[PDB]
Amino acid sequence: SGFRKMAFPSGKVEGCMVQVTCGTTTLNGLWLDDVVYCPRHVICTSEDMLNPNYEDLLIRKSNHNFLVQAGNVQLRVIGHSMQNCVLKLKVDTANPKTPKYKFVRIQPGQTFSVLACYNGSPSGVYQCAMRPNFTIKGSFLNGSCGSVGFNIDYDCVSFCYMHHMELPTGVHAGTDLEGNFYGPFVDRQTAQAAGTDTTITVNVLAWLYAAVINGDRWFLNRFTTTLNDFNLVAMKYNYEPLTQDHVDILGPLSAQTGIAVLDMCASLKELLQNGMNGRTILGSALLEDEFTPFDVVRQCSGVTFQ
Amino acid sequence: SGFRKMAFPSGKVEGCMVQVTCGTTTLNGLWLDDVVYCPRHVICTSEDMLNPNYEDLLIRKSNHNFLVQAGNVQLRVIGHSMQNCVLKLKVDTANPKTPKYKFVRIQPGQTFSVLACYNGSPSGVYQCAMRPNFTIKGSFLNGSCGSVGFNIDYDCVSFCYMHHMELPTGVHAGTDLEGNFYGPFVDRQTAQAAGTDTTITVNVLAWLYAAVINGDRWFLNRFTTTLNDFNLVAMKYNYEPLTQDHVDILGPLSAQTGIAVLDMCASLKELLQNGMNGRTILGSALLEDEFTPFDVVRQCSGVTFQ
């Protein structure tokens, strides 16, 4: 029993974390095969970040201007390239710890595990989700840029995020492993708005399904509702509009617990309109939307990786 | 910025996880040097768990009755021994991935990272604390026994927990790596009480110190209080009695934020007496006590490991 915010095992990703220094700016890099991926603003100074021309700033840089460090071992850069907002550093050595990997671009609401790193060394690992405004609520100090988010399929690491920035609201933003930002954010030290943060409705429902599985079921009401009527209440509370695909994904969870998806939507509707009255659900005093439906199925069945 | 429940990198512990099968019972084991550690009730059947005589049940077992598996490789058991509630299986092979390690017995309130495993393969990693009643609130399905909790000091893994049981209250219990249980729990399928669960007061204060560092500071009141007067309110809410050692540990946090420890105790006192009025602190709608003061200092300074 028990249900917790769980992160994937980070061992396979630790072997791919290196330090990247250019000039006097340092951050983390992802070393897969003979290529190192890092945020492109490693070439910028503090003055450059106010308004950088990355093409012009990169022209003044050669292969020997990039200090790629893996423990005590220096890596020889034999080629550099800018793919959107990430830098690709070709090195003369393949990573001996390269796992089976792919580069995927996750959709809003999907979760992934972040391995926070500083100077190419891992400090911790935690789980977070792509908010509908394409931000994430993580823990990132200075030097944490280059840290990657990932999912694991048994033996295949699915890289999907790389940290680039902290918005002035204390929230974070970044790119995929091809350099394309999640959302309307640019790697530049200027004021940027994150947009309205909405709640991942399908994730709250799966979380409520996990509570029922783990004995916590006081919130189960006596009502039901419809998709269009529940969405009328979801809009008033800035919740993501629930669709039939969201209902389809919650099917296995609805079959295991015997609670129809529309019945849980009414229990969620009453929780929005009446609060929670000081009680708790799975030890949380609010509604948790950072658990995808597969996050619940994976935890309640205990799938393994290596 | 940002503050999250973070777990240590699990890579060094993944290399020490093996599968242990005895008869038709299987669980996880910890393979360090030429010794494998596993919960001793791997020798029990479902009928044996109701009231086992582990000494008598172990006598009928020899070295070849233990199937220690590490991936596809079988390990040859050349010796077995019962140290309290754990079994020590001597094998003919040292673990090539043995990290620098120690066996420590943590005190109540201390936190550690749990690496959940099934069939000797890691499934996830999460952070939890030793509750004052010597339980933990984790996520453990059948087969998760043998999973270990640990802390990391740069390059030294400090093993401190191994999962053995789930109490009928849905909460968990286990031993250290020497076989001694945390609390008054015995590895036997009988009704056992966990005792009154109190709140780790010094951990809530450090968590409130982390919120002030991360901009969330609305809870800072205009009052102060004394140690004996705050403990009078702490007793009414089943909070751990705060001592001068607890104040001493919160010193560095009190110096960085400029808030005296006694001032924060009054802000915590008002949060206990008046609730939280629907607001949130660091995204949580209740008081979080699973963050030690060093957990805050470590996250706000970003210490690394390898």
Major pleated sheet of chain A: 7 strands, antiparallel
- Walk across the major sheet of chain A and give the strand order: 5-4-1-2-3-7-6
Give the oligomer, counting copies of the same chain as homo and different chains as hetero: 2 chains of a larger assembly
Strand content of chain A: 25-35%
Number of helices of chain A: 8
Specify the CATH class of the largest domain in chain A. Mainly Beta
- How many domains would you count in the coordinates of chain A? 3
Give the % helix of chain A. 10-25%
CATH topology of the largest domain in chain A: Thrombin, subunit H
Q: Largest protein interface?
A: A-B, 56 and 56 residues
What is the molecular shape of chain A? elongated
User: Which CATH-level-2 architecture of the largest domain in chain A?
Assistant: Beta Barrel
Radius of gyration computed on alpha carbons of chain A: 22 Å
Order of helices and strands of chain A: HEEEHEEEEEEEEEEHHHHHH
